[PDB]
Every structure is written in C-alpha cells, then in structure tokens.
From Swiss-Prot, chain A:
Protein name: U3 small nucleolar RNA-associated protein 6
GN (gene name): UTP6
Family: Belongs to the UTP6 family.
UniProt superkingdom: Eukaryota
GO biological process entries: endonucleolytic cleavage in 5'-ETS of tricistronic rRNA transcript (SSU-rRNA, 5.8S rRNA, LSU-rRNA); endonucleolytic cleavage in ITS1 to separate SSU-rRNA from 5.8S rRNA and LSU-rRNA from tricistronic rRNA transcript (SSU-rRNA, 5.8S rRNA, LSU-rRNA); endonucleolytic cleavage to generate mature 5'-end of SSU-rRNA from (SSU-rRNA, 5.8S rRNA, LSU-rRNA); maturation of SSU-rRNA; maturation of SSU-rRNA from tricistronic rRNA transcript (SSU-rRNA, 5.8S rRNA, LSU-rRNA)
Keyword Zinc-finger assigned: no
Subunit architecture: Component of the ribosomal small subunit (SSU) processome, or 90S pre-ribosomal particle, composed of the 35S pre-rRNA precursor, the U3 snoRNA, and at least 40 protein subunits. Component of the PWP2/UTP-B subcomplex composed of DIP2, PWP2, UTP6, UTP13, UTP18 and UTP21. Interacts with U3 snoRNA. Interacts with MPP10.
Additional notes on this entry: Present with 7520 molecules/cell in log phase SD medium.
UniProtKB/Swiss-Prot annotation, chain B:
WD repeats: 88-129, 210-249, 252-291, 294-331
Region (Disordered): 455-476
Protein name as annotated: U3 small nucleolar RNA-associated protein 7
This protein's encoding gene: UTP7
PROSITE patterns xrefs: WD_REPEATS_1, WD_REPEATS_2, WD_REPEATS_REGION
Organism: Saccharomyces cerevisiae (strain ATCC 204508 / S288c)
UniProtKB/Swiss-Prot annotation, chain C:
Protein name as it appears in the record: Protein SOF1
Family of the protein in this entry: Belongs to the WD repeat DCAF13/WDSOF1 family.
Feature: compositional bias, Basic and acidic residues: 432-451
Encoding gene (name): SOF1
Subcellular location(s) per record: Nucleus, Nucleolus
Listed SMART domains: WD40
GO biological process: maturation of SSU-rRNA; maturation of SSU-rRNA from tricistronic rRNA transcript (SSU-rRNA, 5.8S rRNA, LSU-rRNA)
GO molecular function terms attached to this record: mRNA binding
Subunit record text: Interacts with snoRNA U3. Interacts with NOP1 and MPP10. Component of the ribosomal small subunit (SSU) processome composed of at least 40 protein subunits and snoRNA U3.
One Pfam family this sequence matches: WD40
Stated role: Required for ribosomal RNA processing.
Additional remarks: Present with 6620 molecules/cell in log phase SD medium.
Record-linked Gene3D superfamilies: YVTN repeat-like/Quinoprotein amine dehydrogenase (2.130.10.10)
Source organism superkingdom: Eukaryota
From Swiss-Prot, chain D:
UniProt protein name: U3 small nucleolar ribonucleoprotein protein IMP3
GO molecular function terms listed in the Swiss-Prot or TrEMBL record: RNA folding chaperone; rRNA binding; snoRNA binding
One BP annotation, GO: ribosomal small subunit biogenesis
Source species, domain of life: Eukaryota
Length: 379, 515, 460, 182
RNA sequence: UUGAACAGAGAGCAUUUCCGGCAGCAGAGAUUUCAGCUGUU
C-alpha cells in the first residue's frame, strides 16, 4: 500500500544517518514509528489538513535535531550526504500532497509558499512559479494571491514585465476589486520613480517623456473609474438617479484615496497628478453635473485644490504670492458658490491655513505671519 | 545494492553461456534477486515492536529464581491481566489450545467440559457439557469452527456450539491438528491410523496406516506441513498425505515418545521419551544436536515458542531454556552450572504447580505468555522473550475485525494448497523432475540420441565389455548371465555367453602364459 | 533484574477515529510466510482458470453488414475509431466503430471492390479539410480507381461534398491498392504495378517486374519509400521509390496472399501463404525466414501486425482467426463462430486492443485482442492484481496442468479433424524421410525456415 | 462465511462447511428431532440393528424362492418384528427391506407410545413426565425415555398411582376417590 | 524548404564556467536570520 511505499522511500535516509555517527538504530526506529503514524493518517480516510501540518512540524523538528547532532558529533555544519536535503524534500512533498488533496486551504498554500521561499538556495524560481500557477488557476478570484505573486516577482527578481503581466491578468479576472487597481497604480508609480532615480544616479555618476510624467498611471486611473463604476452599478442593479449618485460618491472615495497615495509619492509630480484627477472630476460623470449633484463634494474638491496649491510646499518656506493666489482662488470659489457654501469653504480654508502656518510660525516671529493672521481674520 | 547485516534470513537457496539473450536474462534475474533481497532486509527499520527479555544485573541474580508474582508486579497492567488463572476443579484435567491469532482459547476437560472463549475480552463463545471422555480439541481456519476428539468419534462444532458434523471415519483419535493453508484436519489416536480430512469440502483426503500401534505423540511441522508422529517403539515418523509409507523414520528414544515439538522455522525438533530423555534434532539434515539424558522425571510435554524458547513440563514442573536449539555444545540444556560455568545452559525459567500435573503446554501467539493446562484448569505464565513481537497483518491479525475475518476466510479458501503439494522440501514445486535430463535436448540432440540407441545393438554396447583383468568371480558378464532367467534363452543372453566364454578363454591363456 | 515484555498500545493498531482505516503491520521474515512456491503456484493456477472464465472475445458486429461478402478492409491510421469496408457488390461503407454504425455507403464500382485504402490527399492548389472530411481510395475490376470524401463529426469547430472527387482510369483491372504514408502517391496492382499521383490523371510510373500480374501491395510504414507486392507466380517482389525500381524478387512454393510490414521494425514483414502458414521475413536477407507461423488449416487469406509490433493476426480460409506472438511459431488464440465463414480480411486496431474481421457472409466483426481483458479503467488495486496475475502466469506457464488449462480452446469439428489428418500426413512424411535418410549416407538437413523458398533473383 | 461472488463460486463449487456427504443429509439429526432422541448414538445403534435386518433379508432373497428354509425364516422374521411393533403389517416380504427404518423403531419408544396413547400432548412432554416419575409399565416404574414398548406391553403403559397428573385428570372428570389414593 | 528578427515555455540535453569552505565588512528581514560584497582556502 501507499503507506508502505512511502516508508520504504524513507529508508535510504536512515541508511545514511546510521552510516554517519548521527543517529542510533533504535532512535531511527522511534522516528520511523512516528512517521508510520503520520503516513497512515495521511493515506487513510478521515484525514485533515491538521495532520499535514503536524507531520510537517514533526519533520521540521527532526531536521533541527539532525542539525544539532551533526554540529555536536562530527563537528561539521553539514555532511555532503543525502540526509541534509532529504527532510527538506520530504517537507516539500508533504506540502505538495496536502495542497493537491485540500486545495481550498489558503493558510496551507501560504505555508507552502513561505517554506519554499525560505529555503532559497536549494529551491528554484521554476518551483515557485509552478506553485503560483497552480494556486492562481485554482483561486483566480483571490486578489491577494495576484498581489503576492506580483510582489514576489518585483522584489526578488525585479521582473517588471512579469509584474505587469501578472497585474493585467489579475485585473482581467477581478475588474470589480478596487484594491488590485490600487496596487497596479502603486507598482507603476514605483517603476517610473525607480527609472527617474536611476537616470538621476547616472547623471550624478557621469563627469520630456510621458513614462516619466505618469500617463500610464493616469490611464490606469481612468480605466479604473469606468470599470469600477460599471461593475458597482452591475452589483447594485429617480431611483436609478439615486443609485448613480451613490456610485459617484463611492468612486469619489477611491479617487480621494488615490490622491492620498499621490501625496505619499513625494518624488513624482504631485501637482501634475492632482491636476489630472481634478480635471477628471471637473468633467461631468453619470449624466449629471458634478457640482449640482454633490455640492458638498464639489466644495471639498475646490478646497482640496486650493489647499494643495501650497500644501506641497512647506510652511517654513511658504510663498506669500502663492498663498495670495490660493486665497484669490478661494475668494472666486466663494463668490461662485452659495452663501452657506461660501461660509463653509471659508471656514475650511481658514482652518487649513491656520493648521498650516499659524501653529508653525508666530506673528511676532514672522512679519508675514501678522499679515496671515489679518487674512484669517478677514476670512 | 548495499550489503546488510540481516540479509541471511532473506537469502534463498538454489539447487558462462554462449547465448546472448540467455546471458542477459540470467544477469537480469540475478540483479533482481539481489535487489529484492536487499530491499526486503531493509524493511527491518519498519518493525514496530521489539522482543521481550529477562536479564540478570548481578552475579547472584539467576533468571530461574524469578517468580510469577514478581514478574506480574513488574510488568504493565495489561500483560498482568493477560496472565489469567481459571479454577475448574470438576471436569479436569484440561487440554488447552490457542487460536493462531491467539485471540481465542479452547479448553477441553477430560470429563466433557469443552469451552471456547475470547480470553482477552472475557467473552464466552461456546460451552459444552458432553458428559463423555474428551481428549483434545483444535480450532479450524477461524475461531468460528472447532473440532473435539471425544470418546469414539470426532465432532465439529460452530461458533455458538451447535454440532455440525460427526466424523464416523475418525475413530478414537487422541491427537488433533489443523494445517491452516491446506484446510486439513489431521487426526491420530488409538487405532494407529493417520487421517487427513478436508474441512472445506468434507472429503477425507488420506488414511495412512502407521503400523506402529497407537500414536503416543503428534506435532506438525509449520514449515512444510509434514506430520511428526511419535510411537511407543521410540521412533518419530514423518508423514505426507500423498505417500502411504512415512517419509523419514527417526529412532529418537528407547521407550515410548512422550512429546514432540517443532520450531517455527521447521529446522529443529525436540522430543521427550519415557526413558527420561529429551533430544533436540536438526530436521533438514536429520542429525541430532543434543540428547539430555536422565531427567529427574520423564518429560510429559515439550513446546517451542516463536522466538525459540524450549518449554519442558514434567509432572508439576515447567522449565524453559533459551538458545537451547543451536548447534554448539554450549547450548545443551542443563539444570545446574557447576560452579558458575558460563558454557552451561542453565534454565531460562522454571515454575512449579505444586500438587498438580501439567496436561499440555501452548505458547500464546504474539504474546509473552505460556498457557499451561492442568488438573484444575488453565494458567498463563508471563515469559518475557517468548512470543514474536512483530506479526504480519496479512497472515494473522490479532486485532482482526468481523469483516476482515470474512474476507480472509474466502481469500484463504481461494488459495488453499492441494494436499499433494506437501513434501519434505517446500521448494519442490516448480522444479524439474529428477528422472528428467539436466540439460535441455532439442530436436537435433534427441535425434542423435535415438540414432545412438538404434546403433547400440549393432555396436554391442548394451552387454558389458569383456574385461580379462577382472576375475570371473566378479565379472559383469557372469553376473548378467546369472541374473537372467535360466529357462528363457534370448539373443542378448547368447551374445553375453559368447563374450563371457571369450573373456574366460583370454584369461585362461594369460594365466597359462604366466604359469 | 530487567523485566521487559511485549507491550502493545491499542492506539498503534486500532485507530481512535471511526473513519480511519486499520493499520497493517508487516514483517517480511520468511518464517511468518511459509509455502512460497506452492502459494504462488495456486495463485497462478487460479489466474489461468479465471482467464478461461473471463475469455469473452466477441465485442460485436458493425451495422447490418454488407449485402455480399467483405473483401476489402482498411483502417484509418490517424483516427482510432474509423474503418472502410468494401464488398463484392461494389458497395463501400465508412464506419464509426464507437457507435458501430456507418457514416456513409457508396455504390462505388460495378465490379468487385478489389482494393481499399484510407488517404490524406495533398493537392498542389488546395489543402483538404482533414479535420472535417476523410478520404478513401478504391480500385475495382471495372478498370477504375476512385477517390471519395466523407463528412466526419469528430470536431465541432464550425457550423460540403460527400462523394466522388476524382476518377483515375486505367487500361486493365486493378487488384490491390495502397497509399504512401507521407506523400500523395499511391500504387495499384493488377496486370502491372503502377505508381500514381492524386494530382495526375494517369500513372506516374510503371514498376512491374516482367510480364506477370500482381495481386497485393503494401507500403512500408517507417521507410515509407519501400513497397512490397505479391504475384500469382508465387513471387514476392520488393520495390524502392528512391531508385524507382523493383528491388528484389523471391519465389516460394505457393502463392502469397497478403503482406504486412512491422510498425516498429522497418525491415521485417509477414506474408500470408497458401501453405496454410505465414512467414516472417527480413528484407536484407530473403534466403531464410525469421519465423514460421503454422497453426492454420486452410490458406491464410490475410495478415496484420499489432501497432506495437509484438503480435500478428491471421485470418484464413478455414473460417478462423489466429493470433501469434512474433517469438513463437504457433498461435496464442483462435477465434471462430458458426455464423462466421471464410475470412478474407483481418485488421488490428490502432489501440492494439481490438481485431476487426470481414468474412464471406458479409459481416464485419469486432473481437478483443486479449479475450479476458476488459475496457474499463482500472483502479490501482485492480491494476496491480491483474499485473501480478499476468507475471505469475508467465512464471508458472511451464507447469503441466497450468499448460493444460491454458492451451485449451473449443475448436470446430472440421478444423479438429483436419488437424489430426495433417498430423497423420506429417508423420507419414517423417517416416518416409527417415527411410530416405537411412538409405542415403549423406543427406542435407534443410531448415523449416528454408523449406518454403524455391529461389531468389539476387544471390547472397 | 459471506456470500460468495460469482467468480469465487466457480473456483469454490465444492466448498460447504455445514453439509458434507458423510453427514448423509443429517438424517440422524432429523430423526432425533422428530422423536426427541436425547442420546447421540441411539440412531446409529438403531441403524446397525436395521442393517442386520436388511442384510438377513437380502440373504433370504438370494435363496431360491421355493425353499422351505427361506419361507420359514422370512415368516419368523416378519412375525418377530410385527410382535415388537416395528412392522405395521405382515403381508409383504419386501417390507423387510423397504419398511425397516430407524424411525420405525423410534416410534416404539415410550414417549412416542404415550403421545399416541394421548397420555401427553407432545413427545417432549412425555419425555419430561417419564423422567419426573409419573409413568409405570405394569407394576414397574420406568424413568428411561429410551425404553422400547412391545405391542403386548402397550396395554400396561399407565400413569403411576399417587400421580398429580392422575389426580388432575380424575378431578377434571369429577371422579376422584381419595380412598383409592387417586 | 530555409534564414532573420521578436516573443517565449520550464519542458528536454550538455557543461572540462561558478556556488553549496573560512575570515572580515556592510545592508536588510523577523537578539537572531538572510542573501550580498571584499579577501583567503
């Protein structure tokens, strides 16, 4: 039977261990009794994934004991024999059998992947790719596995082509998940930032382009808005107008969180990216006017633009002319908006300018801070 | 193909070619044999248990001084409970038998009280009060059927205890046995006839006439299913159902042979006679190894365990020897070490059933236990090192279930071995006939042999050649003419007479020339 | 005093969970396992008896059969389940063996359908759709060779013409046909052997050895440029297309009916003979045969190899089919039926699992290549049990009653009486040869594999 | 034994653990169940006696038919067996081979006689009443169930006096006389 | 039928390339670990 075959496959390792001074024959017999129990539990009916986990833990501690015994007796870090890789091969085989039998246990899949990544020198990139291929075919609608695949390929191999292909296939399978779009934008921004800093490194060693601009991330942004809106409508499909307004509000939050990612990206042209996203939101969506449909969100976007005109610049090195231009834009927006909207926008702008400059610098310390306090009192 | 220490028991014995296909095929056969033997010996890492032992730490410590109470206190509770005592004062004495699994026990009193039980569970399968003289009982292929040798006829009962069969052909049997691969129930007794009965079909396979009076003892060789009978003339005879005469006759004792035991490997046999002599024989080579002479009292029973312990019961005593079956003279069983001589094999254990007489002995299979039947029932003695620790679940499973028993019954029935396959040597099936030619003869060689046989008459090679040097007293032609019938005259005898006359004339001429 | 006993924890032998199977401790010590030879012998004898119980070879017939006897059978070498049969009334059917029914039937010719083969035509101007359509060539005594297209439902890639594409017209009648395994060319027998092309309406070349007719053809499967042919003058002639010439000729005692090349060995072929035998031949040395297959009673009408090349199948005039291993000179199995009559075509399926036979009664039948085997997929335990049984039967085949059971077949009374008549006649020839060898001091001993050959054109 | 599968039965046609040819159909067990025979060897002792009768009848048949010795001995045997009660009639010679059975002898045992005499409702009841000391054949108490009753001896198979059974039947008919002890 | 450029697969074959010794530097990960660098063997 299968248990007998697997035990007879375990035999040559114990031949090697007895041949070296590492283990006594009785100790080998006790180890094989435990392995007999575990192999019977795996190959019988009524098994669980916990039996696989316990067997892997047992083999791991056997390997640790073997390492200590090889350090102590022979005074060598490792022998050149079968026994130093055979337990590792067995643990990989137990993981493979467990994933084949219960493919739905994502924790066991993660344990398999972590183990195969951890034994880096002995494993193969081909093996990690095969485990990813099996797992991605079995669970194509799990976004985290696609993200982990792309992350492994980006940090370990720095394979930007494979990372792009992984993200594109994953978004083909999961077009409704905002998280995968976000990670794709983050990867592309990381790639172009690394290209920019690599060009800068070259320019300092020795002696434009839409790729360096960020138009790839902008196109991913636009396709994200269309696809996420369409799939959100398909999931939740006068009342249609209310649903469209709710969809626009839902997309607005993801857009603002993309804005926060752009603000996190300091090296990139934040002003360019914010200009593009506010251009998109200035363009009408869902057959309704944005400002008329969501005046609170329109006022929020106007205040966001007015603040981010100078928010990229530090408060210590703030430009009085830029602050005056922002205040003039705020006054124009207040004139355009309703009186309650103008009052709310003025209060928000005053609070933002206060938290920017008034807490940072004193009116006695800076002569321009007195003018800022006067402008805040006027607002 | 690395060489291994335990390879010897996995080795198998066997009783320069120009052909390239044959050379490569024989090379493949030898390679596969060596690989299979090494890979079989490599599986001793997978043995789950180890045999028991009883070791003395000091020089003052003797193993035969160790008592059953001390052993029962020392060993674990399950084995202490397995050592069971049954007091049955009325219908004694009791002859005991164990199942080949060892999970069932079959006791038989002389006054007709026959019981089958699951001794470890404490569950009684059957209990019969026959009110009749009963001598022996045995289990059949399971615990489901058992045979009892009653006063005249032998009876077969099922698991619950109903009579299935009354075997009129088996008369006054005192000894019962079962061959578990041939499904043969073997009876011997007062009539001096050995009878083999097929329990599956119901046909009596063999009636053999021992011609030596009532059979005093009977054992089976588990290796080759040959029955060793012990007669009152002092000979053990070896019987096969396909032959009317015994295969081997061994002159073992002077008086009647009290008991016979054969070890599991079938290589050693122990007999006790009424002459107070216990003899250990090699079976395969048919020499005797040891002859312990003048026991204090004649040994009533011998038993041999699966590990190789030898148990001798003489009246109230039971003594066991360890490593007594070996070839060396240091392995001869003795009773006392004369001043602590290590070459003397003092008994491994001893026990006394005071005021009792041991009826029969049987080692519990795969347990460290020896069951003793006696005048008041049964006891189990704990004997560390007695039973085989590692069994095989395909052959005999002590933890067998009902459905596993049901499947194993049909499996063994399908693979029942025919009675004609029983030989002295189990490796005779598949061999070339002994009368047949050692080398293969093709058409050309057979035609050449036929031509030689035809030309032999013309070349006169049939008659012996004339030898003048050989005297006429011992001459082959003289013996040929003497062995031929006097009245009948044939051409061959005429040529033999002419050649004998010519050789006699030549010898006379040579003698005259010398003289 | 150290007292240690056998202690057995119940956890290692009785599982705690109900759902778990019981553990099987195993000890390979031979003392625990006696009677090796006798036990394996009894298993092998039970395997032979079980084979005799399970021997149920007849799978079934194809359709309703032809109106007249079946004289041409050609398998599709690309497709597993397709066949082409042609009868003596000029009717040709294409068969799906999976559903056991015909795709199409054609009233093809007016004479007997003398030859049939399945082709993959390769035209210069166009490429045929071989996924949707299959093609077959036929040749008859009405002096025609015709090409046919059949619609096939194996693939569903799409949502044409069934029938006559091109008619090749000849001067005399045609007796056999075969096609090239990698080219467009094909050859037809008859009065002269002609190499044709599907793109040309007249023969490309004439390959005839002298003025004798040619009955059957066969293209080599591996060395696809080699051809072999049978003549009515007891001759087997080889041909090579690279030299475009008839390579060698051998003359035997009687006329050979059919030829098949080994799929696995480019230089071996079997010929069916009127000797009641079949002969296995090496192309390089035709002075002797490799093997003689001797079990038939009347003339062997057709021969086919297994795709693995281990076995041949013969169909004869004694209304029987016989399967041979290439090693042994006698048959392994005989197939017969009261409804079966003279067998003129046997083919061996591309799976090597089935045998297709066409008979004089007009029926095409499917048989198992091995009668005791079954076509289900086996579990692991069943597959191991069957393999162990086969190896044990092979090991103990040499035993008397195992041989007695294994060689037993029910044979028709006519075939059995003819066997004993041939045995008596062979014994009479043996005593006459013994008397001749007694009379003559030095007589040559001629080999059984040499006896059938009258001569060869090119000496060795 | 579980039920054999189809391929197993063909290889195991002769296998049977419960019916053997030497059992002869369990005819002995059938007869003992019919007539409540307690001893196991009673059927075989009766069968040996029947075999002696049949062997003697066969020898008398092989004698010539118009033999005074043959006719006298056949009539002697017929009269003796009829007087015992084994043979119901004396008409035919052939009854000495056809109608001599073990069951014919077992029908002359005491419990079967009582059950036919309506003394007991079943043969088993008659057996128990015999062992319990209720039955006398003449003045003699018989506690052996195997005791064989002759045609003449049928007329004295009666209840013992002072029997609770006898008192019960007399009390049922309202004819109990306590002076007679009942 | 062949050539060239491109995109690959992990799926075959070969290696008489290098690495699974040691010392040291430095980085990163979860006090240890990890690969890498510089020497040496």
């Amino acid at each position: 039977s299968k248990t007998r075959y697997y035990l007879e496959q375990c035999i040559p390792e114990m031949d090697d261990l007895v041949e070296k001074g590492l283990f006594t024959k009785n100790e080998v017999s006790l180890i094989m009794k435990k392995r007999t129990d575990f192999e019977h539990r795996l190959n019988s009916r009524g098994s669980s994934i916990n039996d696989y986990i316990k067997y892997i833990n047992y083999e791991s501690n056997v390997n640790k004991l073997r390492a200590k015994r090889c350090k102590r007796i022979l005074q060598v870090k490792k022998t050149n024999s079968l026994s130093d890789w055979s337990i590792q091969q067995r643990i990989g085989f137990i993981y493979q059998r467990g994933t084949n039998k219960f493919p739905q246990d994502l924790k066991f899949w993660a344990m398999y992947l972590n183990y195969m990544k951890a034994r880096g020198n002995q494993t193969s990139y081909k093996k990690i790719h095969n485990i990813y291929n099996q797992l991605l075919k079995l669970h194509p609608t799990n976004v985290d596995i696609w993200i982990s695949c792309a992350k492994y390929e980006y940090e370990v191999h720095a394979n930007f082509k494979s990372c792009r292909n992984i993200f594109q296939n994953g978004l083909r399978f999961n077009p409704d998940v905002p998280k995968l779009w976000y990670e794709y934008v983050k990867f592309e921004l990381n790639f172009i930032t690394k290209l920019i800093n690599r060009r800068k490194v070259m320019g300092l060693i020795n002696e434009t382009n839409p790729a360096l601009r960020g138009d790839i991330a902008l196109t991913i942004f636009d396709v994200c808005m269309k696809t996420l809106g369409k799939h959100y409508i398909n999931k939740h499909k006068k009342m249609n107008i209310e649903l469209n307004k709710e969809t626009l509000n839902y997309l607005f939050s993801e857009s603002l969180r993309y804005i926060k990612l752009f603000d996190e990206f300091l090296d990139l042209e934040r002003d360019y990216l914010i200009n593009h996203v506010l251009q998109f939101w200035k363009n009408d969506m869902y057959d309704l006017s944005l400002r008329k449909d969501l005046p609170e969100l329109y006022l929020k976007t106007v205040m966001i633009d007015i603040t981010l005109n100078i928010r990229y610049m530090p408060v210590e090195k703030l430009d009085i002319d830029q602050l005056q231009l922002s205040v003039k834009k705020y006054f124009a927006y207040i004139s355009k908006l309703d009186s309650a909207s103008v009052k709310s926008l003025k209060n928000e702008y005053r609070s933002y300018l206060q938290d920017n400059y008034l807490k940072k610098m004193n009116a006695e310390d800076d002569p321009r801070y007195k003018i800022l306090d006067l402008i805040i009192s006027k607002l | 193909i690395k060489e291994r220490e335990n390879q010897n028991k996995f080795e198998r014995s066997t009783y320069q070619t120009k052909d390239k296909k044959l050379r490569a095929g024989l090379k493949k056969i030898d390679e596969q044999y060596k690989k299979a033997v090494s890979s079989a010996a490599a599986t001793d890492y997978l043995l789950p248990e180890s045999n028991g032992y009883l070791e003395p730490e000091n020089e003052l410590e003797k193993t035969f001084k160790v008592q059953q109470s001390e052993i029962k206190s020392s060993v674990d509770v399950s084995t202490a409970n397995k050592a069971l005592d049954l007091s049955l004062k009325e219908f004694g004495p009791y002859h005991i038998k164990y199942a080949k699994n060892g999970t069932h026990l079959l006791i038989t009193g002389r006054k007709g009280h026959v019981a089958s039980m699951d001794w470890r569970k404490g569950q009684l399968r059957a209990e019969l009060f026959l009110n009749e003289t009963c001598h022996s009982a045995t289990y059949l292929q399971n615990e489901q059927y058992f045979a009892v040798a009653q006063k005249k006829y032998t009876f077969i009962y099922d698991h619950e205890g109903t009579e299935l069969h009354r075997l009129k052909q088996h008369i006054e049997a005192r000894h019962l046995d079962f061959l578990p691969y041939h499904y043969l129930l073997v009876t011997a007794g007062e009539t001096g006839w050995l009878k083999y009965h097929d329990v599956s079909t119901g046909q009596l396979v063999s009636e053999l006439r021992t011609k030596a009076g009532p059979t005093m003892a009977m054992a089976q060789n588990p290796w080759n299913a040959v029955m060793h009978l012990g007669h009152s003339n002092g000979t053990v005879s070896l019987w096969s159902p396909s032959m009317p005469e015994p295969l081997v006759k061994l002159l073992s004792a002077r008086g009647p042979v009290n008991s016979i035991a054969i070890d599991r490997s079938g290589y050693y046999m122990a007999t006790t006679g009424a002459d107070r002599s216990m003899k250990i024989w090699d079976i395969r080579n048919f020499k005797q190894l040891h002859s312990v002479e003048s026991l204090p009292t004649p040994g009533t029973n011998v038993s041999i365990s699966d590990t190789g312990l030898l148990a001798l019961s003489r009246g109230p005593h039971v003594t066991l020897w360890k490593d007594a079956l070996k070839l060396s003279g240091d392995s001869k069983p003795c009773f006392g070490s004369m001043g602590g001589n290590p070459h003397r094999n003092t008994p491994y254990m001893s026990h006394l059933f005071a005021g009792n007489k041991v009826e029969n002995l049987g080692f519990v299979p795969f347990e460290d236990l020896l069951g003793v039947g006696h005048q008041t029932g049964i006891t189990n003695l704990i004997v560390p090192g007695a039973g085989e620790a590692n069994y095989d679940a395909l052959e005999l499973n002590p933890f067998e279930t009902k459905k596993q028993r049901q499947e194993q019954e049909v499996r063994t029935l399908l693979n029942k071995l025919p009675a004609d396959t029983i030989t002295l040597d189990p490796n005779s099936i598949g061999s070339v006939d002994k009368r047949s030619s050692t080398i293969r003869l093709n058409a050309k060689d057979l035609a050449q042999t036929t031509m030689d046989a035809n030309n032999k008459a013309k070349t006169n090679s049939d008659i012996p050649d004339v030898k003048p040097d050989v005297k006429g007293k011992n001459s082959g032609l003289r013996s040929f003419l003497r062995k031929k019938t006097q009245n009948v005259i044939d051409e061959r005898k005429l040529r033999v007479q002419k050649q004998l006359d010519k050789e006699k004339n030549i010898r006379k001429r040579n003698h005259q020339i010398k003289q | 005093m150290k007292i240690k006993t056998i202690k057995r924890s119940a956890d290692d032998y009785v599982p705690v969970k109900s759902t778990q199977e019981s553990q099987m401790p195993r000890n390979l010590n031979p003392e625990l396992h006696p009677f090796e030879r006798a036990r394996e012998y009894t298993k092998a004898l039970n395997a032979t008896k079980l084979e005799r119980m399970f021997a149920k070879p007849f799978v079934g017939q194809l359709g309703y059969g032809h109106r007249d006897g079946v004289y041409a059978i050609a398998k599709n070498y690309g497709s597993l389940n397709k066949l082409a049969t042609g009868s003596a009334d000029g009717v040709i059917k294409y068969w799906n063996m999976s559903t056991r029914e015909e795709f199409v039937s054609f009233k093809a010719h007016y004479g007997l359908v003398t030859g049939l083969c399945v082709t993959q035509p390769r035209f210069h101007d166009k490429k045929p759709d071989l996924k949707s359509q299959n093609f077959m060539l036929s040749c008859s005594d009405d002096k025609t060779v015709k090409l046919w297209s059949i619609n096939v439902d194996d693939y569903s890639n799409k949502n044409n013409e069934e029938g006559l594409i091109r008619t090749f017209d000849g001067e005399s009648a045609f007796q056999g046909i075969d096609s090239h395994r990698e080219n467009s060319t094909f050859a037809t027998g008859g009065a002269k052997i002609h190499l044709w092309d599907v793109n040309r309406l007249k023969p490309v070349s004439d390959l005839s050895w002298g003025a004798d007719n040619i009955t059957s053809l066969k293209f080599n499967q591996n060395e696809t440029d080699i051809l072999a042919s049978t003549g009515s003058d007891n001759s087997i002639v080889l041909y090579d297309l690279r030299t475009n010439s008839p390579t060698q000729k051998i003359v035997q005692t009687m006329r050979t009916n059919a030829i098949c090349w080994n799929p696995m060995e480019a230089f071996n072929f079997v010929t069916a003979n009127e000797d009641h035998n079949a002969y296995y031949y090496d192309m390089r040395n035709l002075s002797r045969s490799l093997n003689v297959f001797k079990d038939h009673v009347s003339a062997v009408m057709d021969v086919d190899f297994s795709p693995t090349g281990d076995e041949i199948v013969t169909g004869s005039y004694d209304k029987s089919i016989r399967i041979y291993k290439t090693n042994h000179g006698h048959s392994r199995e005989i197939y017969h039926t009261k409804r079966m009559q003279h067998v003129f075509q046997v083919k061996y399926s591309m799976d090597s699992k089935y045998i297709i036979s066409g008979s004089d009664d007009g029926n095409v039948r499917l048989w198992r290549s091995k009668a005791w085997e079954r076509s289900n997929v086996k579990t692991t335990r069943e597959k191991n049990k069957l393999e162990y049984d086969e190896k044990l039967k092979e090991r103990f085949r040499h035993m008397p009653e195992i041989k007695r059971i294994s060689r037993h077949r029910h044979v028709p009374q006519v075939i059995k009486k003819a066997q004993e008549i041939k045995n008596i006649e062979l014994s009479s020839i043996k005593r006459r040869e013994a008397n001749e060898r007694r009379t003559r001091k030095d007589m040559p001993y001629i080999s059984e594999r040499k006896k059938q050959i009258v001569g060869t054109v090119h000496k060795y | 034994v579980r039920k054999l599968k189809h391929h197993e039965q063909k290889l195991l046609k002769k296998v049977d653990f419960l019916e053997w040819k030497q059992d002869q159909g369990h005819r002995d067990t059938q007869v003992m169940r019919t007539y409540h025979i307690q001893n196991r060897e009673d059927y075989h002792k009766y069968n040996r006696i029947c075999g002696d009768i049949r062997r003697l009848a066969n020898k008398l048949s092989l004698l010539p038919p118009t033999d005074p010795f043959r006719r006298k001995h056949e009539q002697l045997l017929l009269d003796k067996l009829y007087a015992m009660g084994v043979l119901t009639t004396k008409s035919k010679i052939s009854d000495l081979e056809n109608k001599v059975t073990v069951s014919a002898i077992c029908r002359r045992r005491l419990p079967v006689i009582m059950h036919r005499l309506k003394m007991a409702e079943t043969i088993q009841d008659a057996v128990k009443f015999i062992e319990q000391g209720h039955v006398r054949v003449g003045p003699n108490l018989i506690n052996d169930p195997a005791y064989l009753v002759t045609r003449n001896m049928e007329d004295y198979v009666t209840w013992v006096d002072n029997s609770k059974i006898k008192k019960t039947l007399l009390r049922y008919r309202n004819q109990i006389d306590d002076f007679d002890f009942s």
